[PDB]
A = this chain, B = another copy of it.
């Protein structure tokens, strides 16, 4: 693969290019997944991890005190201050106005602040076209979508055929679909696609996933639970991910 700096210069999606540049400049491919109960805990952790991450994965559906003024506003300020993007957990899985409104409206109004979101490909390309239209109608700011190509939960049905079907859906819009949540490389380079591979469940080891083609490591509890110091863990994982990245062979 090309370096993050190089991919930032050629990628067709503005959000992807912005992400690749952040990764290059901050020497980090670390995404912090913070699934906490209160806005207070969330803001505290984001403050500590901000300098070490390229992306923050939020989980607004489990927050007990979510609000545009108390949560999104300070979150947007942090994103700006420390330079990292926002990725909301909500796994969209519908089409038409229903999915458009689940992404754009309601109390959460996700499309108004989340740079990146993800969707299940099972419902077909309609989820891609629907979310794309909703994003355009809500903001002029860059928005991108990841397809949930490979799940990690017990008994998941994201088989080889399902993943293949998901990759095919992704090919329908290289401008909006920037990549996948997956455990391995999804190819695509020979066809003119440059997909971001974000991999959760990392603690598999960093060296392992990065060596297999992961562009971003998604780490959750391993960064802040069990009395851990998030600042320290943020640096430990960033270093491990960056060094793993420097080691893998680039496209020459």
Chain A residues close to B by CB (< 8 Å): 35, 59, 61-62, 89, 91-95, 97-98, 101-102, 106-107, 120-126, 148, 151, 153-159, 161-162, 165-166, 169
Q: Which 3 A-B pairs have the closest CB atoms?
A: A124-B155, A93-B93, A157-B165
Q: Given the known inter-chain contacts A106-B107, A107-B106, A162-B162, please indicate yes or no for A157 contacting B122, CB distance below 8 A.
A: yes
* Interface contact A101-B155, CB-CB below 8 Å: no
Which chain B residues lie closer than 8 Å to A162 at the CB level? 122, 157, 159, 161-162
Which chain B residues lie closer than 8 Å to A89 at the CB level? 94, 98
Q: Which of B91, B124, B169 contacts A93 (CB 8 A)?
A: B91
Given contacts A92-B93, A120-B120, 16 further A-B contacts (CB under 8 A): A35-B97, A35-B98, A61-B98, A62-B101, A89-B98, A106-B107, A107-B107, A120-B122, A122-B122, A122-B148, A122-B158, A123-B151, A124-B151, A125-B154, A126-B153, A159-B161
A241 to chain B, nearest CB (A): 25
Can you give 29 A-B contacts (C-beta < 8 A)?
A61-B98, A61-B106, A62-B97, A91-B93, A91-B94, A92-B93, A93-B93, A93-B120, A107-B107, A120-B120, A122-B122, A122-B148, A122-B151, A123-B153, A123-B156, A123-B157, A124-B151, A124-B155, A124-B156, A124-B157, A125-B155, A155-B169, A157-B165, A157-B166, A157-B169, A159-B162, A159-B165, A161-B161, A162-B162
- Interchain CA distance A62-B161 in the complex, whole Å: 32
* Interface contact B161-A102, CB-CB below 8 Å: no
- Interchain CA distance A153-B120 in the complex, whole Å: 13
Which chain B residues lie closer than 8 Å to A61 at the CB level? 98, 101-102, 106
A92 to chain B, nearest CB (A): 8
Which chain B residues lie closer than 8 Å to A35 at the CB level? 97-98
Which chain B residues lie closer than 8 Å to A97 at the CB level? 35, 62
Which chain B residues lie closer than 8 Å to A107 at the CB level? 106-107
* Interface contact B124-A153, CB-CB below 8 Å: yes
Which chain B residues lie closer than 8 Å to A166 at the CB level? 157
- Nearest CB in chain B to that of A148: its residue: B122
A207 to chain B, nearest CB (A): 27
- Nearest CB in chain B to that of A160: its residue: B161
- Interchain CA distance A154-B95 in the complex, whole Å: 10
